[PDB]
Amino acid sequence: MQLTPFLILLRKTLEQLQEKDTGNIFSEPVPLSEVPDYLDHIKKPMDFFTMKQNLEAYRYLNFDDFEEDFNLIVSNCLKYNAKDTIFYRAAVRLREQGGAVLRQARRQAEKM
Numbered sequence: 001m002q003l004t005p006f007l008i009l010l011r012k013t014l015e016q017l018q019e020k021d022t023g024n025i026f027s028e029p030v031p032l033s034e035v036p037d038y039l040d041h042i043k044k045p046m047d048f049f050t051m052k053q054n055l056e057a058y059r060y061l062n063f064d065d066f067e068e069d070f071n072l073i074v075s076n077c078l079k080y081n082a083k084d085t086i087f088y089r090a091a092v093r094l095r096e097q098g099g100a101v102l103r104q105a106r107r108q109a110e111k112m
């Protein structure tokens, strides 16, 4: 397919995913200065600002590479935070609500 419509769709999809993060807790990198142990078990931090940078740097050329980074946002938060926290439940909610956004976008991408 053609590059420009695909990037437009990824931009729209990323905005829809960010809208599901109502607390904006995934909008910028986890502040490593305030979480010194974050990287002890988190191999690759991810957040929506970094995703936007990657999108605009042409790093996402298929849907699965975009979805992989979204899945890291979720999985990193589930891994670091205890189950009884707001952050763990926020990642569950984002997995569910964002999963629906992504399925719809992939169906748009497949019609291109």
Ligand SMILES: CC(=O)c1c(C)[nH]c(-c2csc(N3CCNCC3)n2)c1CCC(C)C
Binding pocket: 025, 026, 029, 030, 031, 034, 035, 076, 077, 080, 081, 087
């Ligand atoms: C660990 C985690 O999954 C996180 C996610 C998804 N977002 C953020 C976040 C955004 S801003 C911020 N601040 C600024 C105010 N002081 C506290 C740290 N933390 C975290 C770290 C939370 C930890 C400190 C309990």
